Design a protein around this ligand. Sequence first.
Ligand SMILES: [Zn+2]
Ligand SMILES: [Zn+2]
Ligand SMILES: [Zn+2]
Ligand SMILES: [Zn+2]
Lengths: 290, 215
Amino acid sequence: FRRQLKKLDEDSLTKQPEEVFDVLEKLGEGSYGSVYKAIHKETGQIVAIRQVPVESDLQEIIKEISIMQQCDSPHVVKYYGSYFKNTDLWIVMEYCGAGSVSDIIRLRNKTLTEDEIATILQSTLKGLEYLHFMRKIHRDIKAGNILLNTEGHAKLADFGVAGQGTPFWMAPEVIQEIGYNCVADIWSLGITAIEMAEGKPPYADIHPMRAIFMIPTNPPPTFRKPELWSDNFTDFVKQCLVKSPEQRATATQLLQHPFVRSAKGVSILRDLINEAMDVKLKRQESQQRE
Amino acid sequence: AQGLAMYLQENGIDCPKCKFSYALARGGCMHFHCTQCRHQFCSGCYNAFYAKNKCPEPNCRVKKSLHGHHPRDCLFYLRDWTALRLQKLLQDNNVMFNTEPPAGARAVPGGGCRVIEQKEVPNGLRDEACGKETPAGYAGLCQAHYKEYLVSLINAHSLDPATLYEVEELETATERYLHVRPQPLAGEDPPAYQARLLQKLTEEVPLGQSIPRRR
Ligand SMILES: [Zn+2]
Ligand SMILES: [Zn+2]
Ligand SMILES: [Zn+2]
Ligand SMILES: [Zn+2]
């Protein structure tokens, strides 16, 4: 029985197998890797275990891990450890119950309101302020890379890895490959702000091989129907979307912008987070045969 | 991608009235309405498309309906030339061109022409690959876009198509750009007449001064 297991219980913490966590559900079978919810038995805390079965560039993953390890801030998804089980590598990291902002919009089939955007963007700007202060660049700012925990706090995840894809969020100086700095995230932030308000980035309906040429040499984008938005919102988007990087506003300056500075508390996101996670629960009841 | 289709779209179409870039090849209508500033223009020669009874140009025989004024070396005309004749103008002025795809291009064996085109779909615009047949010797492009590739080379080096014009072409060209009855002279001859007509047109009617030629 467990009499055999109890004899085996005379083992140290080093001897402990990967039973340290209890896998519960497959939250999303993402292409980067199957991602499972789990609970650490000893701490009772909920973590997310990203299985990396793919023989991807494990340097591309280790580079993502090493960037994650270098960050200690509640605005950035934390990393807890890794282990090998079966044939694949499993990566334990911070759990965000609601998911990415893109899925929140998708699940509710609903665009985010202004006040919801200002709260979500204020938290992310505090994250960008922390990273830029450390002379780091996220490099992949977008709605699908901004996770919300069950409480309602936005968190940056899935750092872009410096190469050696889709351009709609890229700054002009970064696609032209003329060299870029921290304020590159400010451009993608501005595009993300549009993506939150109207569901798609500007040039989304444009082919990538086309958009690569238009974005560097065209006026900074704006709202498709700019009569639907407040002056502070349009001005904030205008100040994020400045083609000259040296002229582009920094994350610190944007935090004092009227649109962000007056952002309401996390409590406003309460209703939409309940909406999104209810569509997730029903989505899991239909895939199971029973 | 990574083929001559990239070359076509790099230069693409830019509105002359407002400096707005579109990564769109030339084809189809070719009288282009700018979405940013509502300007009508020809995608080939960048001339204004004076549509109905508004043309300031003199001797407008075609003011009644949609028309535009195009130089002789605009794609608006050279699109009708054969692929072979265009290659002759290029060779006669010793300008190299592709007949095989560039080495980096790995054309999709099922796919055809990969030039990206905006096709009208319900409730918006959707970009799709051209996908027409890619003949051998056309450098991996379709017939329509391969000619356009050649015309860009001809426009790039400001080659004069009139160097290949026939007598009728010179008589057609003489009345269109010089507003005269081009009938021959008494005491003259058919060969000296061709060289005579060619000489004034080259000396008096310049090539398109607003065609995108990349400096
Ligand atoms: Zn225009
Ligand atoms: Zn023309
Ligand atoms: Zn006219
Ligand atoms: Zn084609």
